[model samples]
Target: IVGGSTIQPERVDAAALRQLGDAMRKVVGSADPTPLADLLSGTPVDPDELTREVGADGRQALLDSGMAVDDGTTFSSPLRGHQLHGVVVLSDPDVEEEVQHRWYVDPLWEADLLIRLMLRRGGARALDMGCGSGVLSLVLADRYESVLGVDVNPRAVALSRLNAALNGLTNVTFREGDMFEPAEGRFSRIVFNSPTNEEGNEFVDLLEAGEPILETFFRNVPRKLESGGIVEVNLAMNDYPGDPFRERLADWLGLTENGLRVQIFTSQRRATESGGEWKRGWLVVAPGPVGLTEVEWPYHDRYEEDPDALL
Candidate 1:
């Protein structure tokens, strides 16, 4: 749902979608056999004569799944260097691919942060609350015994599964649910990306008034975490002068105060904005009144999206 209108989940052929992921992997991982943008946008592409291999209906299915059908939008990676920072992912052509306006998935920069954090030891399970394009979940599969990515958007879940298949990552799974609803039991690593409205006015309201998603996420995380767990959250917000960032962070932790603490990891301004300024950063929240920074840290980035075609 990030780019175009919602496409009914059932309309997608799960089998065909999985096959399409497998079909596209080499095509995507290799040289631009044909421009990814070109093919997804409805220019001609056959990919080393793949149609000859798939044959008849399979070719039609792959074509249908890969390109636009009627007006329904199809998924594609907009990043020219999709694996710029090692991890790879794909998303809608229309959504922002820049540092500030990126979709919920941060396949490039964020992975570096999580990588060193998880380097302490292997984890039993990892959960991605707003899985979006499932980029992180796909990457997390290598480090955890199991990985689950949940999202309310059916399109997100579908795309997550597709990305998982494309990456040939077997330890991960995707499902449809809001926040932790679809995630079961406990996790050693639970990650979340807080939603930020386009304007500080709205984000300031999120800091002042409230957001159920934000509040509940902080509230509900404790129960889902296993012993020695970590919550890696990428947050974005705007503060109008007077209010200190600590108090603003306090607003989110209010409803969750039963038992929680936040360890500020990394914070930075995102981009051109209104009202206050745009900021994005990392926070590691764990149990107790005052959080101790347990996860490894001291990494970096001052990213700005390149000025070029999204693809």
Candidate 2:
């Protein structure tokens, strides 16, 4: 009922649409390989209640939303699992093989930690850089007045849009372009979940040789932020000699000179194949317009208790 002419299942309300999503979750059961007939017919599990909720139109809406499929009486979903915050998300089984080119779910623990910390503050508008499946963007929509989810991959943008629509979130918009090229105006909050290594490069090279992707993002992102705006980034680190957080550190120094502050929330080791390990963490750069340096770090206590904790 919210979207009007452009909305799918034009007559269905948000609750009814959510009912269909719930049905899919019940049938799929968080990343399962069950038959379509089994899902529709209840199989060993009782599907009658869910099927009744789905009804005839609800089933078609699922197909329209790209959350499920039906070919020759078989049904399946490209999506899997309940990503925290009550949001169901797309899952890729072959993530290990497709880490470079395709979008896949990041570790839930890490993502959830960031989400909690991010929601601690409110803003007028937010920008979700590299919004792979609309995870951060969808979450942002709940806290911010408007959100723009931008990605380099066209497929990623499409998926973000689909997921936003599927979840009945309309305050978020999706666009396709590399980094901030497609971003416009200024936002009070900007978040980037960028890759740690450059394409065809290892973590060692990322530390030793420097990453153009990170460099490009650092140089361009500050311009898109409004005064007193905050920028948060997720990066991979090995605690090596190199200063991988160089750009963020530089920003912190400049912003602090003008009365701003920065915080780094690091996590446990991510073991490498060669026995060496690395850490993944968030670098939060908050710029204060004038004498405002105080900001929120909701997870500061937990982080202090366990420097290695993901949550």
Candidate 3:
């Protein structure tokens, strides 16, 4: 039975843990030990348990550790590699709560699937309106020529700038303004996430705002878009939630069809359960020269080739 067969088991040591903790303290400006202490507190965690928990994971690692830390705490567990931060407008508490409840807790918000889809295509100008922590801006700068992150809140602007500098991304920047107030000249494409439910967080308000914002977007985008540009709009459409998107989509199309050539790519998905659950659309508007109509989907029974690649 002896010591351990022919070999000795290597003893586990926490020297690495100690060093990591020390580094965390320096970088995050926190030696309170609250983060990790709070993480492991009241929970009996042994080395084997920790190893199993951290190492034996895939997307679960992101899902488990990536939820909002505390009720009022802005930080969501470290995402990818960066800590997520949340912000709310000063005048609206319910809106603020809704922002936390929805965006902070939701992992989809963390990944920002829509924005990533936009920037991933190629390099171009990208902007994030009402950018909270510049998450979209930072992500945009990673793939685009430049990114302009804008918000009405002064502090948000400051935080966005700080985040950019901290991340060492020079192509990203921030501005303080409402809607598209600060935007000038044209861009390859324009993207925005509208604020929904100023009141009960209804989400319809966002769609209503989108109607007008898109109107402005349509009016201004002709100037902003390169000869043949695209505007990708994602927002909840209609208050009914069940209303077919055709009419509203027609309204948006009507606004721009007269001048800029338009193409509408509406993507929809449904829920099997829950009465409130329904389909949503992500409309991609590819702008073109005067007197041309929008491209309808599935024309060639396959994907349409992008014209921007030539330029």
Candidate 4:
């Protein structure tokens, strides 16, 4: 919700969102446009051009959605996806809106990795913590019976709601609240990813809180997990320390102490076009099948925050 204005779902017409989704799918060639997704990379186009392609209804959908905006005489949409709709913002945002005016969406890699893991983990009811773009939740809705996505960002919650309608999904719900406070009950599957951007020092600040951001969820979120629940996390780090990030996460979660096991599915490091450095990885942890055991000892701080670790 780091925007001058909130993107209200109520202002959007669901039929319009569906029409937009259809037009985008036709353009991208898949509701789950994993292969031809790059076709959507073409930036904002004239609303009339979209109308010519999708007809007058498509133009009204774009205009009424308010997800798109008018900069003087121009009407352009900043939103897109395959199943996510039309073209997606494939990489991280590098504009003023990365800190203002826009809801942050997970890059394709994170969504791809999470969807990969979601398939491996069986599902019933699921929770998406800090659900951001709600893409993960929307993807989850396809496999899980029901999904609840919660985020501290209002823009995210609203956009997520708009997306559910855009994709014609009803089993998924998005709400605004900090962390687990907005979620109710236990979940069979839980997915999370820490939102990171160049300007949003809030994530770095959370890391500065004396506990790695992952540690907070590891320590407390398990309390709301179901018998066979699993927690999956994909994070992009800015200047943080840890070798074999998954092993570091295992330590942070104190998994063995909690009767849980961990697996790191993907690990990567990269240099941004803006000259910043970062590393990120994906992993999932869960307790043994009959469920977790009662805890006797207190959870300990196992994550070390070293500013130079990324160097």
Candidate 5:
């Protein structure tokens, strides 16, 4: 919604939306018949108002949008629509594949906040590395001239394409490959919401010890970045004890100000039985060109401009 043209919810087929809502309602039932409400909660619009727009033809829309029918009764989807940054992104909320290889959702709020900072201003072209479920790519499509989303998983590529169609967006494309392997030419901005942990999954890696993936991404990202281009990534703050990751990242980028451009947003600890633990925030490796002058609060001042906006 941070673009020249606003998305008209009325343009979406109400009949199809209503059917999809009914199917989702049957799936969750009374125990948790709030899937549609929960999915639509991220945006500025009211859930009930939006629900009223969905009509009887909603189920077909869900099927066309890649939701699967289970046993000819209930519907299921590997991807679900999550509202964020004033838009809804259809991403994988329940990937049943390798748990380690699944998309990053636990820290999605941090990633979403980071992306809002990085892509606030429109660009000529952008690239989303490790574009799981194509969430970032879809958001970039709204703000950039052209956007490319690449993932190692072929299923992700297919799902991303479907999501783009569901949202009625056409400026984004999807490809299946490892990091930057499918990438060509320099981009105005390159975003990598890398996973904080490293395992057998090539999609992400740890930032500490022997971080082969992290080192590879940092080493090659510079070559793909155009002059004055920005690179935004995510990391766990506590994982790096003495700012080693910052130093190494700065050294890799050849910065002269001891990582002066770095901006971190540390989130508060969540309540738990044992004790509350804080999750680390995003790392804006290049903040100047992105309109982010200094480290501010978790919610950017842009959200404050609108009375209806909430984070």
Candidate 6:
């Protein structure tokens, strides 16, 4: 849904679509690699036919494993009909791996890619601020030793918790809070991904209102962050090349103060405008000795797209 319009079943390659659809159907009502019991016993498990064969026993196992076609989606998860698994739960359910890849390939998770890339790069502890449905939070847990996913919505928090369970991932935990208020400590890596309107004005409004909250992140990070730890911030906005906001970011992160040792990893700017003007990119920043510094590593010029590419 993020990129090109839905393809008709006939338009899709029959063989490929059937193969993928069959796999999805199998995974839908089943755990990864089938039920946990069979996985433990080293036996091939047929989630699809197991119920008819083993009846109650198999049904309980599937239920206990948190695997069910019911997990697929209702009207809740927008991409339900697309054959994706749920990752996080909110107004919509979250998904991982293949589903995440699907969204990314479709360009749905384009903005989220920045956060995912940053977390994958490396981190000891990571935090997902306002983690909606724990989509990124689940991803971060896979990459980091410890991850905390927080959101203001109880439903979101619950969904995040459920997602962690489904993945059998223990490193990440979810909690309810309005951003930083519920957090207990500092993290070596932190992410705050927010939505932005296509217009620059709304982006500016977020910046203006977000300044104070972001300052809390900056101020609190130093106290808890391991020495030389880095904090990564993400946002979707209408950014122009060489805009003043970049410089302001330097100031807020103690980049301009010349007191804290830090460097702003190249920033990813995504524009909302058309005419090949609107864009988005992920940026990495590291700690240095005072002031905002620039990383001298090799960096891409920008995220480009071919006109013929699928969305």
The candidate that achieves the highest lDDT relative to the unseen native structure: 2
Candidate 2 weakest ten by summed lDDT: 1-10
Clashes of each: 0, 2, 3, 3, 9, 21
The whole-model lDDT of each prediction reads 0.56, 0.58, 0.43, 0.57, 0.53, 0.47
- lDDT of each residue in 1-311, candidate 4, tens digit only: 33333356676567777666655656564445321233234355555555566677655555565555656554644554544322222222333433534344543434643454354555789898877667777777777899999887676777778777767777889878867887888898888866543332344432122234556667766687886677776655444443333454556666666667665532455665556445555556666532222221111111124322322
What does candidate 3's lDDT look like per residue over 115-167, in tens digits?
A: 43453464577766667556666666666888887776564565455446435
The order of the candidates by lDDT, greatest first, is 2, 4, 1, 5, 6, 3
Model 2 residue pairs with clashes = 36-75, 42-47
Q: Model 5, range 175-262, lDDT digits (tens) per residue?
A: 8887789988888878877655423123332212234555767778768877666777765432333343455655665555323355
Give the per-residue lDDT of model 6 (tens digit) for 26-47. 5543545433233222233455
Clashing pairs in 1: none
- Judge candidate 5 against the unseen true structure and give its global Cα lDDT, from 0 to 1: 0.53
lDDT of 4: 0.57
Taking every candidate in turn, the Cα RMSD to the unseen true structure, in Å, is 6.9, 7.6, 14.5, 9.3, 9.6, 11.5
lDDT of 2 by residue, 1-311 (tens): 10011213334555656666565455444455334324433233233332455676765665565545554445555444444566654433323432423333332324555676563577898999878667888787778899999876565676667667657787889888877888889999999776673231343322122345666676676678887788888765443333334344456345445455666665545555555445555777775343323222435457557744533
TM-score of each: 0.66, 0.69, 0.50, 0.69, 0.62, 0.54
Off by over 4 Å in 6: 1-108, 119-124, 197-216, 237-243, 258-279, 288-311
lDDT of 1 by residue, 231-280 (tens): 88776555555763446556555524445677765446543443455555
Using alpha carbons, what is the TM-score of model 4? 0.69
Candidate 4 residue runs with Cα over 4 Å from true position: 1-6, 29-46, 71-73, 82-109, 196-211, 236-254, 269-279, 287-311
Better of 4 and 5 by lDDT: 4
